[PDB]
Design a protein around this ligand. Structure first.
Ligand SMILES: Nc1ncnc2c1ncn2[C@@H]1O[C@H](COP(=O)(O)O)[C@@H](OP(=O)(O)O)[C@H]1O
Ligand SMILES: CC(C)NC[C@@H]1CCc2cc(CO)c([N+](=O)[O-])cc2N1
Length: 252
């Protein structure tokens, strides 16, 4: 197909929750558009200064005139990106739809129990889980402090629309997961939505986006809980990111 000059603006809004293939999608979108895609990894590795901006945004977003102030902040944060995935953005998908009226919406989904088990190993271990101590240690090596965890928890609460949330309760999380995914499919016009099951790969995505399947490039498969466990252990061992970054080429 012909090469065309794509606009550097948000073209794709992904509503999928963490641990649903969002980093693979981020990588795939960057392969298609040759511009960056937002993801929690963007905050952790490139823009930790964004953390307080997202926290402020979530704080203001329970609240027209104040709507515009928030929408402007949302635009500032996403400037120069061509897509959004993952926390903290995914909870804002309805607002992003208004701000970027020509952007299409994706929903990444998977088996709810596989999701919960992935989440527990990586994002939200039970507070009695000894692994949680390793996660906290690896996080410190990356320079992630209490404000990062606050942003993580608050943006999940915001996505699930729940003033508080027993994070140690599987049944609660499973119910929020199903309800969240259900509400996305109800809220977004089917013309504007593509639902992607883990493992679907390039074809339905590229069709939806009217682009050619990348030549000879397999659809990304990254950010497994096994890989994140290795990253955590390596961070603990070497006490820096830069010491090991060459060992995780596509992941980061
Ligand atoms: N192309 C692909 N095919 C199958 N699973 C994939 C995949 N890309 C990512 N995943 C899975 O999606 C999860 C990561 O999602 P996210 O990037 O949103 O955190 C991981 O699940 P597991 O932890 O169960 O291995 C990872 O294995
Ligand atoms: C030791 C290091 C690997 N820990 C970082 C971890 C794993 C990556 C990660 C990803 C997300 C969302 O994709 C969130 N989140 O939901 O805020 C938190 C974290 N925290």
């Amino acid at each position: 197909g012909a090469m065309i000059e794509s606009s550097t603006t948000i073209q794709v809004i992904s509503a999928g929750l963490p641990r649903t293939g969002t980093k693979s999608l981020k990588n795939a979108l960057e392969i298609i558009y040759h511009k960056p895609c937002y993801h929690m990894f963007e905050i952790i590795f490139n823009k930790q200064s964004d953390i307080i901006k997202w926290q402020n945004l979530i704080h203001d977003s329970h609240m027209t005139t104040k709507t515009i102030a928030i929408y402007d902040k949302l635009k500032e944060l996403l400037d120069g990106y061509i897509a959004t995935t993952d926390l903290p953005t995914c909870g804002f998908y309805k607002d992003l739809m208004n701000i970027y009226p020509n952007a299409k919406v994706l929903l990444t989904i998977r088996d709810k129990y596989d999701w919960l088990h992935s989440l527990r190993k990586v994002v939200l271990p039970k507070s009695n889980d000894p692994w949680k101590l390793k996660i906290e240690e690896g996080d410190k090596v990356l320079g992630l402090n209490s404000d990062f965890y606050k942003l993580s928890e608050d943006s999940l609460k915001f996505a699930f629309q729940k003033d508080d949330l027993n994070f140690d309760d599987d049944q609660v999380l499973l119910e929020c997961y199903d309800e969240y995914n259900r509400l996305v499919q109800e809220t977004v016009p089917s013309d504007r939505l593509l639902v992607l099951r883990l493992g679907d790969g390039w074809e339905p995505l590229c069709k939806f986006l009217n682009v050619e399947i990348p030549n000879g490039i397999d659809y990304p498969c990254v950010n497994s809980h096994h890989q994140m466990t290795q990253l955590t252990e390596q961070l603990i061992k070497y006490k820096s990111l830069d010491a090991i970054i060459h060992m995780f080429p596509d992941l980061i």
